[PDB]
Each structure stands twice: as structure tokens, then as C-alpha cells.
């Protein structure tokens, strides 16, 4: 039935959500209430990259990204690395992560990931600072024009 996967190159993928960092407030709120929040997550060739933030509550810190390709059935705990740059916050540390996308990805299975920060004898779980990090392809995303931008007042 299904067409074999012998020789084929799928276009790059995109994100179905707006970067978290974008909103300093809506962002810090998660890093202050959950003590953890993803800064930015870029996409690369059959691979991804992103840096997660954490509160300097304790010394020992454990950051691991949880990703799955089977409607949250088969996930793998990937160890995060540490970044040392001028930009990186002095107090709050900055851990990075590099996950390798699966061979292929079709519209027959779901794919989402979440952040898992362990500290102070606790386990903070940040799943797309809302529901889940829905990752879709770039060719799937539909383009809709003739739309007006939204804008509102600044909370006092």
C-alpha cells in the first residue's frame, strides 16, 4: 500500500509556534512560576537546536529534552549541554540541546517535545509553555494573505 521510502529528500521543517523569548513578560512568567522556560529553538537539516533557561535555585542542575515521534509513545531522554558566552546570563545558567530529527516525517504520526528541569528536589515540566511544541513541515504550512496585523495597548 504505502509507497516505499527508497531514495527521497524531504524539505526542511518549521515551527507551529512563535518563539517564547519574543515575550519577555509571558516568558519570565514561566521561568518564575516553573523555574524553567525555553529561550529559542532553531531548526536545521534533519536536526534542531535550542537553549533552555533555569533559575539559580540550587547548585546541581539537570536539563533533559523529551522528544517523541510516536504520538508520545516512544520518547528518549536527551542530555543537554552547557553554554558559556558573554550573552548568557550571569546568575541563571544557559543549557543548550541538539536533537537529530528522524529519518522522515509524514502526516501519519505526531511529533512533540517538552523540557524537563530537575532541581531543589523537584521536577519542572515545561511543555511548549502551554500544550506542546507542535513541529510541522515548511511545505505543509499554508500561506494566507489579505490579513491585517493585530495590536493592543500596553498593560499598566
Q: Which residues pair with 42 in a beta bridge?
A: 49
Give 149's contacts (C-beta < 8 A, 6+ positions apart).
none
CA–CA gap between residue 5 and residue 28 (Å, rounded): 43
Angle at 18 between CA 17 and CA 21, to 5 degrees: 130
Q: Is 115 helix (H, G, I), strand (E, B) or coil?
A: strand
Distance CA 115, CA 36 (A): 8
Provide the grid cell at 47. Answer: 536536526
Experimental approach taken: NMR
Q: Are 131 and 125 in contact (CB under 8 A)?
A: no
Cβ-Cβ contacts under 8 Å for 44 (sequence gap 6 or more): none
Domain boundaries in the chain?
12-138
Query: Which residue has cell 534542531?
Result: 48
* Fold classified for 12-138: Immunoglobulin-like (2.60.40)
Amino acid at each position: 500500500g504505502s509507497s516505499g521510502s527508497s531514495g527521497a529528500e524531504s524539505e526542511s521543517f518549521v515551527l507551529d509556534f512563535s518563539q517564547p523569548s519574543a515575550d519577555y513578560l509571558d516568558f519570565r512568567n514561566r521561568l518564575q512560576a516553573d523555574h524553567v522556560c525555553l529561550e529559542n529553538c532553531v531548526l536545521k537539516d534533519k536536526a534542531i537546536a535550542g537553549t533552555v533557561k533555569v533559575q539559580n535555585l540550587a547548585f546541581e542542575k539537570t536539563v533533559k529534552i523529551r522528544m517523541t515521534f510516536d504520538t508520545w509513545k516512544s520518547y528518549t531522554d536527551f542530555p543537554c549541554q552547557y553554554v558559556k558566552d558573554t550573552y548568557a546570563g550571569s546568575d541563571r545558567d544557559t543549557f543548550s540541546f541538539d536533537i537529530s530529527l528522524p529519518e522522515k516525517i509524514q502526516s501519519y504520526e505526531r511529533m512533540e517535545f517538552a523540557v524537563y528541569y530537575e532541581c531543589n528536589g523537584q521536577t519542572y515540566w515545561d511543555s511548549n509553555r502551554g500544550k506542546n511544541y507542535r513541529i510541522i513541515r515548511a511545505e505543509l504550512k499554508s500561506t494566507q494573505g489579505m490579513t491585517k496585523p493585530h495590536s493592543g495597548p500596553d498593560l499598566g
